[PDB]
Structures are given as structure tokens and as C-alpha cells.
Amino acid sequence: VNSFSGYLKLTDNVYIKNADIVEEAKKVKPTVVVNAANVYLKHGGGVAGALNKATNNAMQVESDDYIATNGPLKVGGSCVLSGHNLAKHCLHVVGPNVNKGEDIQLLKSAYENFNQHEVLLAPLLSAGIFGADPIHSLRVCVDTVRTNVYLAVFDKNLYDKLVSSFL
Ligand SMILES: OC[C@H](Cc1cncs1)Nc1ncnc2[nH]ccc12
Ligand SMILES: [Cl-]
């Protein structure tokens, strides 16, 4: 039993809800919130900009130190950093950005990072401003993640389309 509320159950392990991931994280304070990161951990817009704003820029400050020490992430890769006031940990995961010409096949690799964590609050990787098809991102999530994932879909109209089209 966990404290996630109001989710539709898609499979044994994947749940979905129309919600603002920032507000969800503040309410649940999950062990792991997933950020839709880029390789530079520059949290400007989309989920990343919103999460970082909610931390009063502490996420960005921590991220800049991480990059100065370790260099950029790989597309498809991840790192674990603090969750600040939102969660215990933030798993920064880099899905491919179609608006940069990155290989959509890397989306499966990106979702594989979720399997290192028993329970996660997450967005659909490569969706939104990353330019991939969200219906595809959900399919890859369901077919790749084996741990318990609670998906927050900000757009109510998109959420209804994802539910009604889910196979
Ligand atoms: O796939 C990630 C989606 C993509 C979008 C598609 N249409 C509108 S945003 N983004 C978000 N998802 C959940 N919470 C969020 N908070 C802030 C952004 C955000
Ligand atoms: Cl987005």
C-alpha cells in the first residue's frame, strides 16, 4: 500500500492520472520523482523547468555542480540527485528529444532506468516539448518498466486520449 490516490490502473505495475507532477510530488512526497531532463541538466522548461521552479532553483544549483564534476549525461541515461522539497530523490532521466533529431529507439533505454527503483512518480518520457508521440511513450513505458510507476499527465485532453486509446 502507498499514498498515491486517484490513479487509473493500466497494468499490473503502471498507473496513470491527469495531474500536475509538481503538485503531486508536494502532496505525496514520493521516494522518487522522475525529471524529464536533458544531458546538461539545464532545467528550463516543461517538467524540468516546473520541478526546478518549485525547488526555488536548488535543483539547478545542485545540477550545475553535478555537471561540473561528471560532465553531461547520455541520451537514454540518468542520474540520482536530491528530491529537495518535492521527494526524497529525483531521478533525472534523459529521453530522446525529437526536436533535436535524437533517436526515438533510445526511449526504451531511458525507461529502463526506472527499473532500478521500486516505486516512482513520473512523466511520460520524450512527451511534451521533447516532441515524441505520447501514445508511443506510454506503450514503451508499459512494455519496459517492471517496477511500480505512477504517471502524471498534465494535459487533461491528452490524458483522456491516452486512456481511451490504451491497448
Ligand atoms: O510528457 C511530459 C508532459 C508533456 C506535455 C504535454 N502537453 C502539455 S505538457 N509534461 C508534464 N507532465 C506532467 N506534469 C508536468 N508539469 C509540468 C509539465 C508537465
Ligand atoms: Cl513538456
Domains of the chain: 8-163 (3.40.220.10)
Beta-carbon count within 10 A of 96 CB: 22
Question: Which residues surround ligand 1 with Cβ inside 6 Å?
Answer: 20-22, 36, 46-47, 50, 123-124, 127-128, 152, 154-155, 158
Experimental method: X-ray
Resolution value (Å, 1 decimal): 1.0
Distance between CA atoms of residues 161 and 50, nearest Å: 23
| Ligand 2: centre distance to CA 48 (Å) | 8
Q: Ligand 1 test: best mutation among 24, 47, 86, most atoms within 8 Å of CB? A: 47
Ligand nearest to the CA of 161: 1
157 sits in the region (left: phi over 0; alpha: psi -120 to 50; else beta) called: alpha
Radius of gyration (C-alpha) of the chain in whole angstroms: 15
Q: Is 162 left (phi over 0), alpha (psi -120 to 50) or beta?
A: alpha
Nearest CA among 86, 98, 105 for reference residue 35 = 86
Of residues 45, 31, 155, 121, the one with CA closest to residue 83: 31
CA 65, CA 164: separation in Å to the nearest integer? 43
Cβ atoms 81, 51 nearer than 8 A: no
User: CA 92 to CA 97: how far, in whole Å?
Assistant: 14
